[PDB]
Amino acid sequence: VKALIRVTPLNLTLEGLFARVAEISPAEGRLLQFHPLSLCNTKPGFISIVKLETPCLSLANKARLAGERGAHAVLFDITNDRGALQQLQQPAGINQPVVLIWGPDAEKLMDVVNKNKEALVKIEV
Amino acid sequence: CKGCLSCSKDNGCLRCQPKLFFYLRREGMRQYGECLQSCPPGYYGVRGPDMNRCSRCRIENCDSCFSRDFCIKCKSGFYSHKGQCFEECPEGFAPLDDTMVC
């Protein structure tokens, strides 16, 4: 089950994959990067973007905590760990949707954040 | 990427050397890790479960923390006593001639 991702300042267009652990739906919000160790133990209405390295919590529980901290949706950049996708197939019924990305799409997304020019992000199914 | 053991350009420092303190520096959209000699002003050191980390200094009218219930330097114009800061310097001892210490 695929998903569309779009980005504009106040442009980019990417693709990805929903996770079976969460509930699939659209979402909108601002783009905020989060460190993997941040999600352990900012104003709301944002779509988090977390680049996973190759542990504090399970990825599901990391996605759980992200939503519980006020996140519209969880974007996992899994370029450096493709095995993350396999371990997000088990259903947990997370509310906010968990979309996965990698490759030049993920590279592009992170450069927009790297540029430090504020921008909004949306997701369609 | 300075002071780390394992490192990424996107996440900054992932793991630290035992000698340094881990700390997530925010920058609008960006958030990258840092390993530092000591915790930055307004934070005190905490030897966490896996990592040496930095917790926010939350004492009444204190500006710099050594620990959770002990203050290094108070809000300018407040008088320090046993790691606590007071405007109304208490009845234990009076303020010293010039320096702000009861």
Residue numbers in the entry:
A (entry chain A): 35 to 44, 56 to 86, 93 to 105, 112 to 182
B (entry chain B): 40 to 141
Give the exact sentences the study uses for this entry:
ZNRF3/RNF43 specifically targets these Wnt receptors for ubiquitination and turnover, hence reducing Wnt signalling responses. Here we report a molecular level analysis of the ZNRF3/RNF43 ectodomain structure and its interactions with Rspo proteins.
The crystal structures of the ZNRF3ecto–Rspo2Fu1–Fu2 and RNF43ecto–Rspo2Fu1–Fu2 complexes revealed a 1:1 interaction between Fu1 of the Rspo2Fu1–Fu2 and a single ZNRF3ecto or RNF43ecto chain. The interaction interface between Rspo2Fu1–Fu2 and its two receptors RNF43 and ZNRF3 is essentially the same. It involves an interface area of 990±105 Å2. No dimer is observed in solution for RNF43ecto, even after binding to mRspo2Fu1–Fu2, and we also see only a minor propensity for spontaneous cysteine crosslinking of the P77C (corresponding to S90C of mZNRF3ecto) variant of hRNF43ecto. Furthermore, two glycosylation sites exist in RNF43 and map to the acidic region of the β3–β4 loop and the β1–β2 clamp.
